[PDB]
Every structure is written in C-alpha cells, then in structure tokens.
Amino acid sequence: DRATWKSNYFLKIIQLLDDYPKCFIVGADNVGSKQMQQIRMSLRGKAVVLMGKNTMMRKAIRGHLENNPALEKLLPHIRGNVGFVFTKEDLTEIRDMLLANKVPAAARAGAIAPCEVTVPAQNTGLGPEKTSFFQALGITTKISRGTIEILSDVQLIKTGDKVGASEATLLNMLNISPFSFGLVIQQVFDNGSIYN
Amino acid sequence: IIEPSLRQLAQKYNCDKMICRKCYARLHPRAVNCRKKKCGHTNNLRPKKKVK
Amino acid sequence: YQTFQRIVENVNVIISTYGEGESGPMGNIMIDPVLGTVGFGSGLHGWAFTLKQFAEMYVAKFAERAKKVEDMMKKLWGDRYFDPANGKFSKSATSPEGKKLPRTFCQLILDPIFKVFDAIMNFKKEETAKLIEKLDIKLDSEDKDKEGKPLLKAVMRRWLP
Amino acid sequence: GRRPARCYRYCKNKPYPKSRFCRGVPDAKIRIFDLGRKKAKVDEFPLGGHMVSDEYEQLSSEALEAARICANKYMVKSCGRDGFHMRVRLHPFHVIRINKMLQTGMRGAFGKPQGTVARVHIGQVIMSIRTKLQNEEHVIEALRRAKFKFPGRQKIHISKKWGFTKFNADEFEDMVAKKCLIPDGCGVKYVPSHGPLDKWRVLHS
Amino acid sequence: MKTILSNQTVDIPENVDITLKGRTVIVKGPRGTLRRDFNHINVELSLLGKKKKRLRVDKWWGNRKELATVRTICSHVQNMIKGVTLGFRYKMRSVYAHFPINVVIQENGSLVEIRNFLGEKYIRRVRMRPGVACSVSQAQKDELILEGNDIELVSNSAALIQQATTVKNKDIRKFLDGIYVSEKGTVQQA
Amino acid sequence: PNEIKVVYLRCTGGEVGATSALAPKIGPLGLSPKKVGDDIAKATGDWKGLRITVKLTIQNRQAQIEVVPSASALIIKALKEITFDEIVNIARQMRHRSLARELSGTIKEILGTAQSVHPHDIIDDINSGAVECP
RNA sequence: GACCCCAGAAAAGGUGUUGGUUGAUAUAGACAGCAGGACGGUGGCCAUGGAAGUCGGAAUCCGCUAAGGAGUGUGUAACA
Ligand SMILES: [Mg+2]
Ligand SMILES: [Mg+2]
Ligand SMILES: [Mg+2]
Ligand SMILES: [Zn+2]
Secondary structure, eight states, X not given: OHXXXXXXXXXXXXXXXXXXXXXXXXXXXXXXXXXXXHHHHHHTTTOEEEOOOHHHHXXXXXXXXXTSTTGGGGGGGOOSSEEEEEEOSOHHHHHHHHHHOOOOOOOOTTSBOOSOEEEOSOBOOOOTTTHHHHHHTTOOEEEETTEEEEOSOEXXXXXXXXXXXXXXXXXXXXXXXXXXXXXXXXXXXXXXXXXX | OOOHHXXXXXXXXXXXXXXXXXXXXXXXXXXXXXXXXXXXXXOOEEEOOXXX | OHXXXXXXXXXXXXXXXXXXXXXXXSOOOOOOTTTTOOOEEETTTTEEEOHHHHHHHHHHHOXXXXXXXXXXXXXXXXXXXXXXXXOSEESOSBOSSOXXXXXXXXXXXXXXXXXXXXXXXXXXXXXXXXXXXXXXOOOOTTTSSOOSHHHHHHHHHHHXX | OOOOGGGGOSOOSOOOOSSSSSOOOOOOSOOOOEEEOTXXXXXXXXXXXXXXXXXXXXXXXXXXXXXXXXXXXXXXXXXXXXXEEEEEOOOOOEEEEEOOOOOOTTTTOOOEEEEEEEEEOTTOEXXXXXXXXXXXXXXXXXXXXXXXXXXXXXXXXXXXBSTTSSSBHHHHXXXXXXTSEEEETTEEEEOOSOSOHHHHHHTTO | OOEXXXXXXXXXXXXXXXXXXXXXXXXXXXXXXXXXXXXXXXXXXXXXXXXXXXXXXXXXXXXXXXXXXXXXXXXXXXXHHHHHHTOEEEEEEEEOSSSOOXXXXXXXXXXXXXXXXXXXXXXXXXXXXXXXXXEEOSSSSSEEEEEESOHHHHHHXXXXXXXXXXXXXXXXXXXXXXEEEEEEEEXXXX | OTTSOOOOEEEOOSSOOGGGTTHHHHGGGTSSOHHXXXXXXXXXXXXXXXXXXXXXXXXXXXXXXXXXXXXXXXHHHHHOOOOOHHHHHHHSSSSOOOTTOSSHHHXXXXXXXXXXXXXXXXXXXXXXXXXXXX
C-alpha cells in the first residue's frame, strides 16, 4: 500500500502544481493537528494547503522540471519542516489572514517558552482546593470571596527556557493565554520568483 | 518533603530499573538481556515495582 | 517563613471549604498572622511568641499605642521587604541599587531568634552575653552558669515566655 | 499415582494393543481428537501446519491430552472458536505395564496394564492444524507451545498440501475446476477417469 | 571474519597538541596535560596532517571483539581533548526527606564529609581522586561541583560520593535520601 | 460574563432522575438551581434524546435553558423506533455541521458510518444525492 | 576442553561468537537516535456505582488529512 500511497501523492502534487501558478512555502511550527484543521477550514474557500516529505517533494519537482521549467528555483528551498499552499488570491490578503488566525496554544510541558508570561494579581475564580498547585510554585495566596486570590504579581517563566509540568498545569487551570504560534511563511513563489 | 524535581532524580537511580526474573539483578531501564552469567543472560525481565 | 505560610494557607482553605461564608453568623474566621490569631514557638522548651509581642517592642523601639501596634503588625508579616542599610521598609522585591531585600518577617523577627539560636548553640560566649544585655533578658543564679541547650531553653523562656 | 514418563519413553517392547489377550486396560486419557470447526469445508481452511517428531519414542496418552488442550487454548485465543480445526494424529494403541512392588521379588514379574501410549516414528506427524492463510503465525506459535508437553524433539512444518487433503495446494484449485476433486465435508473425493460413464454424466451436469 | 582494516579518525582543535609515545597519548591544552596509555589494545595510532591535525586509529585483521576497541580509543581521546580544553564538571544534588545532608569540603576539595545523612552520627569521609576538586555551589542550596580534567577521575569521584550515601535495611523506593549526579557538563561552556 | 459561568454540561437522560443523578453534586457550580432548577432542566430534556443526552445549560439565575448538541448515537437511536435515507439526509442540516468537512455529502457519510452500531455498503457505493445536502 | 568399551548428564535458555536458511524495509531518504504532530463525529453501542481509547461483549466505520488505532502500554474512582 506504500507504493500506491506514494504514487497517489505524486499525482496529487503534480496536478496541484499544474492547477495553481502561485504558491507560498510555509514552515509548520510546533502546531497541533487541530490548528491544521482550523487552517484548512479557514482556507477551504480559496486556497489549498499540502504538506509531506521534503524528499518526496524534491523528487516530484525534479521529475516535472522538463515539463515546467523555472520550478528548479524551489529546489534549494524545501528545507526543514515546511510545506506548500496553493493560492489564486492576492498575496497581501492571504498573508494577512494567515497571520491573523493564530490559535491560543496552551502551555505544553517540557517545551521552550518563546513568550514571556507573567501572572497579575487578580482573583482566579478557582475554589480553595486548587491551592495545591499554587503552593507547588510557592505563590503565596489568600482566600477572599470564598475563592483563591493571588496577593501580588508573580513572574512565572522567562523566554527561551524549558517549562515544567507544574507551571504548565497552573497555566491550564488559570486559562491565561500562553505562548501561541502558527505556520509562518518562509518564502513566496509567484510564477518563477523568490521573495520574503 | 522532597520536591518533584528531586524525586525524579533519586528515582533514576533507585526505582526506574529492570529486574531479572531469574536472578533479581538490577538492570538499566532499557535492558533486554540480563548482564549476569549465572542466569545465562536471559531476556526474562520485568520492571522494578513502584510504591504507588 | 514559607513553611509557616503553607500551614496558614492549608488551615484557611480547610475552614473556607467546609465552614460557612464570610457573611455567615460567625463572620470572618480565617487566621492571619497580621491579625494576631496565630502564634509560634515551642511548648517543650516553654517559649512562645506572637506578632503582637514583637510589634510591642518595636513600637517601643520607635489607645494610641494600641493603634500603633495594630497597624504595625501589617508590616511585620507578609510579602513586604526591608533593607537593613536604608533602615526603611519597601514594597519592592528589589532595591534601587539592586540589593536583594529580606522580608520583614525574617529580617526583624526571625533574625534575632536565629542570632541567639546560633550564639548559644555554637558556644560564642561574647555574642550570647551582648545579645542578652541588648535584649534586656534577665537571668538568675543557677542559670547564668549553664551553657548549651539548657541555656538556650532558659533564654527564650525569659524572653518570649 | 503415575510413574514418570522417562520410564516409558522408548519403544522397548513389541506393540501390545488392547485385545482379547491384554484385558483390563484403563481408558486412555485422550478421547477427543478433533477440535475447532470440524465441520468446515475443505476450501475454507487452506493452510495446514504439522508437529513432526524427530525421535522414535513413545508419547503417553496424558501428554497427548495436555498438548491438545494447550494448542486448543492458544488457537481459540488467537483465531476464535470457529477459525481453526485441529486433529491429533496419534492414537494411544500401545499398552504399557507396571509390576507393582509394595510373592515378593521378580518371581512372576509380568506386569498389569498401567496406561496407553502411542509409538511415534521419526518423521511422523503428531498434530495438525488447518486454518485460514493469514493465521500462519498463530499456528506456528500454537504448535511451538504444544511442543513443551512432549519428551523428545519436535519440528514445526507448514505442509505444501491443501488443508488436510493429500493434494498439493498450488494444484488443488484447478484440479477442483477440472472436476478431478469434489468436496465432501472437511475433505475431498478424488474422481478417477475410469468407471461407469453414468458417473461422468452425473458430473458435468 | 577478520576485517582487513577498520579505521577511525579524530580531529584535534588548534589550541591542543597531541604527542604519541607508541600507544601512549599525551594531550596538552589550556587546562593542563593528560596522559593515557592504550598498550592493552593492538592498534596503530598515527598523526596525519599539520593544519587539520587528525589522529587516525588503525586496526588490521581484527575480529568482532577487537574491532569494538577502535571507537573506544577514539572516544577516550575525544574525552581527553574535551578535558584539556573545557574540563569536566559534574553537578550533584543532595536529596533528603527529613534530615538535611551536611557536606563539608576539606583541604583543596580533596575530602568530602557527609554528616547528617539520614540523621545518623556516622561521618562519611570520601576522598576524591587526585586532580579532582569538589566545591559547594552558591547558586543552589544542596549542590556539589566536581571539576577536573579527566572524565574518568571526576565521574569516579562522583560515584564514590553517591555510593557513600546508600540506604541499608530499608525500602530504597521509599527512602530516596542520598547524593546523586544531577547533570554532567563542562567548564567554560565553549 | 453572562452574569455567571454556567456553560457546564450534563449527561442525564431518560427518566427524570433529579437528585439521583449527579445534578445535586454539580449544583453548587451556580448554587441557584438546586431541586427546582434541575427538575425544570429535565422538564424540557425528557424528549429530544431519551439517551444519555449530553446537553448544555444557560442559567437565567432562577431557571435554565437547555441546548442539546446532536450526538450521533443520540439522534440515530431517537430517530429509530433499515436505510431511512430520507430522514438522515434531512437531519444533516441542523447539526453541528462542521465535522471538518468540505462537502455536506461527507457529513452524511460519516453518520451513515456511525449508525453501523450492515449500513456501510451504502457509503461503499455512494453515488446518489451527494450534493443534494448543501 | 581433551579420543571405542569408559567410567558422569537432560529438557530448556543466551543481544558470547561463528556459519547458514527464509523474509522484509531502503536516496520516492531504511534502521537507531534527537525534534514536532498524534486530530473531528465521538465521553462510538451494550454493559454500571464510574468506566471517556486502554475492567469487559460485540462491532473495526467515516471526513480532514502528511498521519493518527472509536486505541500499544503507564496512570485516575472516573477525568486529567
Ligand atoms: Mg521387553
Ligand atoms: Mg557517547
Ligand atoms: Mg524493613
Ligand atoms: Zn539475570
């Protein structure tokens, strides 16, 4: 079944290149499958996004080099966790809607935190039994209005360091907006052209 | 009152290990064969039991 | 101080979940070290202290007195910081210089206790003598001779009975 | 209550079947010899695997019962109650004897029937399992597990025949198509090209 | 099967000089000098170039057992290069439930005293291997630092401390007290 | 904030249940409904799913308003008492209607597959009314 | 370990090494590592005090897809 699956990918990539003249090469970050489902539903009207093996893409493009020249410019650019998206609408609108639909990704434990988050002093709204997590982080808290109330602002995690499980689950209970990211455009291909 | 970070470190040397079913030898958690000649380097291993 | 904070929080969340609300007939029931409803010390050596006792002697260091000690118990306990060099309190965890500040609870309640605990238990004769004179703790015959843990017991017995 | 099988492991005596001379034989331990879907048609189960013996020795009826249950339990666990058909191809027809020592000594030493064993020759088939073609690893594992209930050395074979028949599997299909074979229950009937023509007329019609 | 030739090469940095006396490798760098003789293994050690400074380990007609001793030497030399440039630093965290473990670093870091391990009056005096210095961190409450040029010496000294604090007659899954190697690193982080 | 955070769900159905379900224990979330609130909750919940009836509520601070999401097994067993291709087709309009689809034909394929609890051959050779749904 | 009778060993094992048989994957990028994702109907049906992928009986489908089993194990009373 692997042989037929690869061939189906080849006819899939080859007919999408023939159909669309304009594409964005885009690098997928640490984005969940739900994020990709949201993107595909967002773009379902106008654009179609395809991702797969980079070595598979390079082979299919090299086979199509003779029939469609000037596609060799994409050959020294399929590097890293990147994929295609096929568009016919204007570049600035496609880019703008792409940079706008970013999901609020939650804090996953053990990962790098590129966004520096700080927790202000406000009533969490959580009952006086989730205080185990607050005491785990040493955050001094008092119970006011029959619910957890943080006394003062606490800095939780800085940029460029690993997050822990206790920090992650505290963010999950607090439901605050942690570091979030989506697919970001590496380059753009407009009928044989390379830009940023 | 050990913090969770230090509980992980001490368990790396005390609890997260494989045990031979033939000679009870304490092996690393990725072992597939016992290292000891008296059991014939058998592959009958079981995880070391936890306290949970 | 963190351990004292954990006990206070654990007690408070117990009475908050199971007991009535703040608007119940009893009213506010939570314990506060700033309120003087929770004390410290050890019963085996016969010495205990409250936030009230320290604020009494620090207002003395500084109706009317009742108000003074009551408002001072707020700055005695909590996440408030005190620079030894400046001599003034602060609500900022970092000084303008950049010096890390100690919290007021450890800086002027636990600090004398740690000084006397270290002094007696490490047999520093001149340090113990100067501390007793400065803190005006009075000792008597058959007690001035002893040294070691019994001397430690007698000192806090007569300092914070 | 029974001697170790090491005392009766080798075919040292002439065959001693239960007959009008050997009387008083207790019933053999194994009474059932086919399990699974015995009623399955021939074309349902094309794969046949055997447990062949390597030693000319005696297998006790108690070992045959233990090994038949052992293979049955694993085949049920992996192929379902209706996914396989097993057939123990040894019957315990030889009677072993015991000389009971509590006239003392070797005087009147001829023994009484103790049990039954089956004498197996080198290359003889002890157990056969037929099943679907995809269950090959389960057949090999079931026969391998049943090997531990037997004394000697046994080999696991995957026969080139179709199921339990005596015809090679690569020729079974077109032999049935050309009417040389007609199924009858779990086996097939070979129809030769000689006989009354009325039987040739019953076929092809 | 005797493989005709199994060879492996290690690249030496510019600021390091490796000198060979037969199968004795002398590695000299900014942090000092390391010496280690591989006379227990029959290999051909040679120095290849001038600007690249390669060290090649050859093994002719070796079977499986002594073909495994080619990468072993190459990794030992790479550890020697690592030691004389960056040095080896093993951080150890002391973990305890009730009784804090008191560690006193004696003369030159050569001696380590563990006083209150599981609250017992016995004093464990562990001596470091020569060339290894132990220290108490100012960045963590309960943390030792074992620094030295030789990975073999430093990690052996760390194992001496760790096996010194071994619980007996109890359930080690429950009583986790002791000193354990937390992270294995270097100095100068370059 | 809708004056309350009451978007919490419920998994009761069939009989009234009231206190015998988890309603009294989950009642202190809003603390207003209690016996009257969860009784009038089941009042409109008796029908529109006699199964587990995974539902959601919005509190009017004294009463409740219930919304019943179209669970596949719920609507299939409630519509049951065969193919009934007409009734499944007309029911794939008012549901949650997303199902990560691209065509409304895919939704009826997925629930025609979920109703297998064989009715898979219809999906196997599906060639009629594919774009009739949208 | 070391020579007919003959003077001591079996089943069963071994990621010790040596040879051999058969099969499978691979520059359309094997394997092993490190690094992301592992979704939606759906907490699928019947089971019950709770069984949400993972106590069990059966089913074993679908869209989205690069891929994701109505689930290989760990874990929770169930969740997580
Ligand atoms: Mg005889
Ligand atoms: Mg290594
Ligand atoms: Mg004991
Ligand atoms: Zn072993």
